[PDB]
Structure 1
Amino acid sequence: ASNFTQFVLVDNGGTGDVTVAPSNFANGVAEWISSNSRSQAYKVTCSVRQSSAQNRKYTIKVEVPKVATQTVGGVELPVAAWRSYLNMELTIPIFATNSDCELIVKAMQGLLKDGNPIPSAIAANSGIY
């Protein structure tokens, strides 16, 4: 393998897709950023570590820019009004096989699948009702 490659983070059907490419690997923490200023960039980082004697833990972080009314290349303050932050922690017990691990990935894909409750509440600036 060698999975440290460029990938499409936001699929817009070929036109205006957001691709994210390897940009840093300091300390085993892989980073991928889009082609923008770091203030307006799409950013992804990932790392695995053994949290305790029984678990391994993946920490994945995603930063997404506020695009509506954005001035490309501009200085937009406050930083917090223009960015969203995703932080995921996946704890997997050392007994989990590749097959167990494949199922965990499907559970994550199913959760965020289009039309499902969670992605629909988020996309609509809503909660559950």
Structure 2
Amino acid sequence: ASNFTQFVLVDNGGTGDVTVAPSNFANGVAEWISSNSRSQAYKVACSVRQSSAQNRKYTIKVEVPKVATQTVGGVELPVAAWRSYLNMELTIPIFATNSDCELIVKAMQGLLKDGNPIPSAIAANSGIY
């Protein structure tokens, strides 16, 4: 393979989708950003490393812009009021086969699937109740 390619991060049904493309590879950390200024870009970074003798660990970081009332190309301060940060760490024991790993991926997809508790709480500015 060669997985370092462009992909659709936000699928808005073909029209107005957000595609994110390879942008940096310094230090084995793959980065992908959207076609925007860096203050307004959708950003994704990923890396794997053997965290310890028994585990491998993926660190995935995502940055998503606050879009409501955004001024395209404008200087928007404070930076913290306009951006959301996602930080995921996936620890996987060295015994995990490809199949085991495929299941872990399904568990992550199910967790965020539409209609499930977590993605619905987040989308509605809520917690669990």
* Shorter-chain TM band: over 0.9
Q: Distance in 2 between matches of 1:124 and 1:15?
A: 24
How big is each residue's C-alpha offset from its partner over 1:19-62, in whole Å with a ceiling of 9 and x where there is no partner? 00000000000000000000000000000000000000000000
Aligned to 2:76: 76
Q: Distance in 2 between matches of 1:26 and 1:2?
A: 17
Equivalent residues in 2 for 1:93-104 (5 A)?
A: 93-104=93-104
Q: What displacement does 1:112 show?
A: 0.1
Secondary structure of the structure 1 residue equivalent to 2:88:
strand
Q: Distance in 2 between matches of 1:116 and 1:52?
A: 33
Q: What displacement does 1:5 show?
A: 0.1
Segments of 4+ moved more than 4 angstroms: none
Over the matched positions of the two proteins, sequence identity in percent amounts to 99
Aligned to 2:89: 89
Question: Gaps (5+ residues) in structure 1?
Answer: none
Q: Distance in 1 between matches of 2:94 and 2:2?
A: 22
How big is each residue's C-alpha offset from its partner over 1:55-94, in whole Å with a ceiling of 9 and x where there is no partner? 0000000000000000000000000000000000000000
Q: Distance in 2 between matches of 1:125 and 1:15?
A: 26
Q: Distance in 2 between matches of 1:56 and 1:16?
A: 36
Give me the TM-score of the superposition, normalised by structure 1.
Answer: 1.00
Q: What displacement does 1:14 show?
A: 0.3
Q: What displacement does 1:103 show?
A: 0.1
Q: Distance in 2 between matches of 1:24 and 1:58?
A: 17
Q: Distance in 1 between matches of 2:72 and 2:85?
A: 20
Q: Distance in 1 between matches of 2:59 and 2:85?
A: 13
Question: Gaps (5+ residues) in structure 2?
Answer: none
Number of residue pairs aligned between Structure 1 and Structure 2: 129
